[PDB]
Amino acid sequence: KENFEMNVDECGIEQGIPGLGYNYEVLKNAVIHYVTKGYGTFKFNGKVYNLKQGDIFILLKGMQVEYVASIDDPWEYYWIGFSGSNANEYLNRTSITNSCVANCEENSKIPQIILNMCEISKTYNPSRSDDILLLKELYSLLYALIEEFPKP
Amino acid sequence: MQILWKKYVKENFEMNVDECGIEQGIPGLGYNYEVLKNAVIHYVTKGYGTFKFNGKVYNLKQGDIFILLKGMQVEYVASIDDPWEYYWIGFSGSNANEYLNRTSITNSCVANCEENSKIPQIILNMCEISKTYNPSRSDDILLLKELYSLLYALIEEFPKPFEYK
Numbered sequence: 001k002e003n004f005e006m007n008v009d010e011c012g013i014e015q016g017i018p019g020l021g022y023n024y025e026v027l028k029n030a031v032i033h034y035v036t037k038g039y040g041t042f043k044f045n046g047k048v049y050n051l052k053q054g055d056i057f058i059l060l061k062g063m064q065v066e067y068v069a070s071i072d073d074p075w076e077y078y079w080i081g082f083s084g085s086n087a088n089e090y091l092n093r094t095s096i097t098n099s100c101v102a103n104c105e106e107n108s109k110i111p112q113i114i115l116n117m118c119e120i121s122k123t124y125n126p127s128r129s130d131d132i133l134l135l136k137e138l139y140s141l142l143y144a145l146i147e148e149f150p151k152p
Numbered sequence: 153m154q155i156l157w158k159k160y161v162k163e164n165f166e167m168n169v170d171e172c173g174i175e176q177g178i179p180g181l182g183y184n185y186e187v188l189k190n191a192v193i194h195y196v197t198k199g200y201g202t203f204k205f206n207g208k209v210y211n212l213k214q215g216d217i218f219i220l221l222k223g224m225q226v227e228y229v230a231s232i233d234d235p236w237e238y239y240w241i242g243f244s245g246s247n248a249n250e251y252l253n254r255t256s257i258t259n260s261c262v263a264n265c266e267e268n269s270k271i272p273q274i275i276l277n278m279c280e281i282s283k284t285y286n287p288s289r290s291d292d293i294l295l296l297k298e299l300y301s302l303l304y305a306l307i308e309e310f311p312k313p314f315e316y317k
């Protein structure tokens with residue numbers, strides 16, 4: 001119901017409103033975002049990233065962040081909030097938590113896993129074991145982040 | 153008779169891969185004991201053997217699964233003529249034991265995999281990963297992913313009526 005080792009906290013899909021975003025200190029453990037369409041800007045630690053389709057950004061507890069949809073073509077993004085002792089150990093095996101921004105390559109497994117987790121969560125039915133399927137997918141996602149963004 | 157027997161640490165309390173192995177049976181030889189481990193699923197890949205539990209006898213062949221649960225008094229023995237080969241996954245955890253309550257397989261502890269079953273590929277993949285187990289390449293994440301896949305496939309292919317509480 002709430003797992004300690006590996007937990008899918010929340011899944012969502014946001015359509016940005018032109019020029020609108022968020023500016024706050026992250027409370028949640030970890031939230032990975034995948035940009036499916038349009039444009040927005042992520043600002044962290046004095047750096048600015050103009051993101052587009054194929055881009056990922058990750059929020060971690062304690063980060064002071066600003067992210068805003070572009071005026072002209074405001075982004076759509078899929079997001080997975082997750083927690084757990086296993087999850088935080090696996091996040092330390094990827095380089096993505098250095099800048100907290102990355103570009104998915106053409107043959108990336110990451111987009112299909114994030115889209116599949118958000119699809120499952122739309123009709124979430126634990127009596128049909130959708131809970132097993134979301135945890136399966138979270139383990140797949142963390143493996144794919146490590147494989148595609150290794151710590152060298 | 154063990155081609156493979158990889159024992160893992162009880163690292164996790166929610167879901168843990170305890171061990172993976174491959175046994176080629178010796179004609180007429182087997183085991184007779186009270187299960188100590190949480191749960192062990194066996195998939196028969198070739199040949200024939202017999203599983204005996206609670207006064208029932210099952211002659212198993214390729215495609216068959218049998219599951220051992222803590223406290224079961226069991227005997228399983230390779231046939232004389234064409235002794236079985238079987239792959240096995242030992243696993244534990246609070247999530248694992250909750251998911252086992254959603255499948256009908258724990259009634260007789262024996263089942264037959266259908267033609268289009270996902271179970272054989274997952275078990276064979278987990279035993280293959282265990283052969284060159286490398287946690288620095290995150291083989292630990294891969295085995296847990298596969299164990300979640302395995303428990304999902306058991307529930308999908310051997311459903312029990314279940315209302316989530």
Ligand SMILES: OC[C@H]1O[C@@H](O[C@H]2[C@H](O)[C@@H](O)[C@H](O)O[C@@H]2CO)[C@H](O)[C@@H](O)[C@H]1O
Nearest residue numbers: 173175183184185187188189192240242
């Ligand atoms: O665990 C599956 C594995 O069991 C072996 O038998 C062992 C068992 O693992 C152990 O807990 C118990 O104490 O003794 C048994 C041997 O008597 C089987 O040898 C192997 O083929 C698998 O089925």
